[PDB]
Design an enzyme around this catalytic site. Sequence first.
Site, PDB file in Angstrom:
ATOM      1  N   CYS D 161       0.691  -1.223   0.052  1.00 27.42           N
ATOM      2  CA  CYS D 161      -0.012   0.057   0.097  1.00 27.42           C
ATOM      3  C   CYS D 161       0.853   1.321   0.138  1.00 27.42           C
ATOM      4  CB  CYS D 161      -0.893  -0.073   1.293  1.00 27.42           C
ATOM      5  SG  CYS D 161      -2.157  -1.102   1.461  1.00 27.42           S
ATOM      6  N   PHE D 212     -10.120  -4.670   0.095  1.00 28.29           N
ATOM      7  CA  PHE D 212      -9.451  -4.616  -1.066  1.00 28.29           C
ATOM      8  C   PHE D 212     -10.339  -4.452  -2.349  1.00 28.29           C
ATOM      9  CE2 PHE D 212      -5.782  -6.655   1.093  1.00 28.29           C
ATOM     10  CZ  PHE D 212      -4.893  -5.423   1.293  1.00 28.29           C
ATOM     11  N   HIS D 300      -3.614   7.636   2.412  1.00 28.07           N
ATOM     12  CA  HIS D 300      -3.984   6.292   1.765  1.00 28.07           C
ATOM     13  C   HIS D 300      -5.211   5.708   2.748  1.00 28.07           C
ATOM     14  CE1 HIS D 300      -3.940   2.079   0.481  1.00 28.07           C
ATOM     15  NE2 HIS D 300      -3.559   1.647   1.664  1.00 28.07           N
ATOM     16  N   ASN D 333     -10.094   0.060  -0.554  1.00 30.49           N
ATOM     17  CA  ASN D 333      -8.547   0.187  -0.506  1.00 30.49           C
ATOM     18  C   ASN D 333      -8.149  -0.424  -1.630  1.00 30.49           C
ATOM     19  OD1 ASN D 333      -5.951  -0.221   0.037  1.00 30.49           O
ATOM     20  ND2 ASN D 333      -6.166  -0.918   2.046  1.00 30.49           N
TER      21      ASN D 333
END
Lengths: 207, 208, 389, 387
Positions: D161, D212, D300, D333
Amino acid sequence: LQVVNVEGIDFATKFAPPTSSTELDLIGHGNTGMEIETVEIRFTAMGFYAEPSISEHLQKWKGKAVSELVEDDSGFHKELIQVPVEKAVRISIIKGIKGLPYGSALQSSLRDRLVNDDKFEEEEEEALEKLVEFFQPHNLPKGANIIYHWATPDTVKISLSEEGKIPDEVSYTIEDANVAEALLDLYLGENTITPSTLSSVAEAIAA
Amino acid sequence: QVVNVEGIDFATKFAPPTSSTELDLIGHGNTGMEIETVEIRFTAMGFYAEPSISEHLQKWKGKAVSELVEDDSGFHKELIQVPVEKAVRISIIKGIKGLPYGSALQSSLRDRLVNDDKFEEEEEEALEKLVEFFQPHNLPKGANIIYHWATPDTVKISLSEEGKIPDEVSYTIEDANVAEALLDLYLGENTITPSTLSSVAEAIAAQV
Amino acid sequence: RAALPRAQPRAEGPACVLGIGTAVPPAEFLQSEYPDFFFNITNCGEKEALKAKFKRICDKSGIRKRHMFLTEEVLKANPGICTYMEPSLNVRHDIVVVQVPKLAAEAAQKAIKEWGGRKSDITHIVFATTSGVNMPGADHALAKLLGLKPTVKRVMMYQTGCFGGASVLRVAKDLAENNKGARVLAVASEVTAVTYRAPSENHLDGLVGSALFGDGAGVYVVGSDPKPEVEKPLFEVHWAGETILPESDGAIDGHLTEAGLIFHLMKDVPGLISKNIEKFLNEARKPVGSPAWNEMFWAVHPGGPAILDQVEAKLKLTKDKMQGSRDILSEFGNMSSASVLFVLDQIRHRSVKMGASTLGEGSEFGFFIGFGPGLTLEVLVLRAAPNSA
Amino acid sequence: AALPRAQPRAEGPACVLGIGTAVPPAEFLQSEYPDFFFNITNCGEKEALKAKFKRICDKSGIRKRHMFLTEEVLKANPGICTYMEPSLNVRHDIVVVQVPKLAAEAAQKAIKEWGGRKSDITHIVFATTSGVNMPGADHALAKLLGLKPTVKRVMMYQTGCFGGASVLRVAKDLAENNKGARVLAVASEVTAVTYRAPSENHLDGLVGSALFGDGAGVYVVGSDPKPEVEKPLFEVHWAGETILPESDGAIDGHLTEAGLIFHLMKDVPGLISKNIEKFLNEARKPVGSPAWNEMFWAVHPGGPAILDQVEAKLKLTKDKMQGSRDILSEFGNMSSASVLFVLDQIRHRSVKMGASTLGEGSEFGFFIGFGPGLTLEVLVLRAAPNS
């Protein structure tokens, strides 16, 4: 008389491509391959098929030496590509590969030839993209058969059997005339990737 | 005879591999954490010691657990420095590979040693060998690790990947500073298993 | 709104190679004995014609020996690796995730010693490998093995292939030149446990990798503005570039599979490189005054004997130019991204042994060349330092 | 002795000249995902496990995610719908095509916003965590876009990430050290390598399966923009990274015969929020150390817990994390691509509210990623004026 052995593979001498009534004769056979650090590699075994009337269209080359036919600027290669008969190429995979590398290698070979002929625009570019997308979900293991069939000079019917049977259906059709001609050039042109198959065709014509 | 820890049977009485000394289970618990609402258990753990341990921790008997476990209490170091044989059994709940387990042990012990001014080339080499002992192993769910402080200066490590209780010692830590740091990893104020430490502190406090 | 001065100041001079270190696994495999060992440990001793083809490759390979972590003991402990296509990636990764950063750390200690600085002044790691992947990456693992500062900036280039040694020098060039005081570890480390495979008549081109690939790691310390009388530059980097070669598309495939890494060779790689290399080198040399080919030194990746032979012949090099490359091919085989770092070091060693005027065997400028899938041709132009203790 | 720099360097700071993003077409509403996911993986009978998963989804802060793995793709690839059967080959067959293809869609958009011509792109910097290949995705992308054969390439496979910050850090040095250089900074993720059937033995794997999603972001980066021709959106003034104290071993990512498996061994939100301020305090010094609430925050969106705990630790007002929370809500994400989306959303929020800069009125801001290590990557950006 019924079969010829090409790199260990049996190639029929007479053959009607999938969904086709027209029967084609084996005019020449060969391989793609190379040598690397002394070992001979074979990628595929190949046979070129056409209607038996092809010899009548190429009468001028009869009795000439194969050296004359295959030499650069002879004019034989394009004449052979342009002959108005149904044609087919059969490919038997020897070195197993994935469909994506195979289709992508086609794409770049045909693109090189099209660019060199000032024939590569967005239409041809899109047609090759879709050709790659046809091949990319497939596996091409040892034994897999690919049939390219030019029923007209401007289309290519593609038949594929991963398991090594002879396919009886058409899975995909190239509908771009320039791509279809460039694919014939890939195997029969002056820069053929199988000089063995071209020399074999040339021998049968000049005989 | 047996206590159930995270669903795994831990004997109340245990002699570590190749030892004749029998040890009492003083406390039990887990390593684990919560992540984005879900609770994860890495291991079930049991702390074992000679029954005489309670005599040495007399001043703590009768006190409340919050006094013992609290920071600056002095219970942690006193528990760590008690002169009896001790053992920790680890039953793996979350299967992991041997290399990450040993490497995380290495960094955990390195931090403690650096903080105490006790991390030199000798201790660095000892942790490197400890990782090399663990790295060829797999630690699937059920695997058992026994750490045994026969002396305070050594740690006998026994391992059964298949989840039996091992009968033979597979590796020995010979560095005294590493041995104490490994005990501190489980019983110090920054223990990775506050559950096991509370369980031990309770057993010590719940005596006349 | 007004412009601001560069917040992280840049450096002034060209990026310099300040120190070099190399490392190989200890076990040596003599190429004259490899066909017997390889075919026996993979249980292919009955394949006599296949073995004969392999002997022919080995005899032509120009390799005297290779270093390998995959000893008899390690192969016996990992039988999946000794098969042709059984599932084996997990035990392969178990090997390389440790061995690739460990070997690099051994090479880096030596590079750092020649450089003469202290490891806390290392500001960057640029790391290439083709030998597996992991998270955290081998760059992070290397940082810990060396005990670098937690703030080291990292560029991890996994799965490069044989051009990766040029790639790390190219990345190091910009990192060092754009950052005042930056000192970069440019790292290439390779361990064959992800590509090792039993021989097969269905994978004849794979016999070539099995004959050529060895293990090794090289590390350079790279930095601009060397401290006078404290740091000593060995080579200055003046140009870094790369190109895909015409009509080379599809020449090399590398698939990472449940059975490890498989290479497919689909075109004549020596032919493609030799046919196209001069046109690219002719552009690269212009910024250094376009010296003649035989006025330059040649740190060329020894991918195999045919590449070196055909390039030498195309460029009409005198036979000394490729000697450094052939020396590395002889003593180590093809160590993938690490090999070219070994070659430049050997050119410097040859220069010292022969009393040449520069560390490029008397040439002022030279090439540092890698190549790989694409086909990608990576070229840097270097200036060799004078030969003076 | 000394020579002039043979490849001329640039002068000004590396600038973001254009931005593009792309996602796969199929949308998976988080409110419907537990039923779909547990059914398609043949775990519909695991009632207790599914209730744990539904509780993660309910608190995930995600409204939808985009995925190439439709029901049709998953049925075509049954090995991916298992827990641990060998499946890397069919996973790679998906991602080696889809990862550069998605990057190409985003790059066309970034190039269009930039306004220049693609033959002027001189470099590609590419991060992904979604499989590996040879030639790499960078080579595949260069062909898809028809770039020049001489484009210089930095392929960063298996980042995790933090890779979105990584490509911007690498683009900075490549742009600034090369006169005229125009860099494609690329991050593209497709979850076919991590997708995995749920299991009580991999409870931390439930988190990845809830968070994800897929996407790609691409920035055109370059120094010295042509006046009246190129328009800088952000200037890059600082790039750095650090491993966080006591964080070693927090995240393992093993590429296996069964694809990519994550193991979470430590409290990642706690480790980041406990240590982030000391590092950010060094990073802001070269732009005059503005106060936290005088800056914008392209963070993030690894999960709601990280955003919530960093927000609470730094005492940020609620708007600061809104861009990150908008991206988590609409995309989940997307691993390395996520933070590139976040900076774009901060720009979009600025335009919609009429702020004085593309950082919602702040002059300086952070561009932050994190990943295995634990690695914390930080860049300090300056937002362009907005009228």
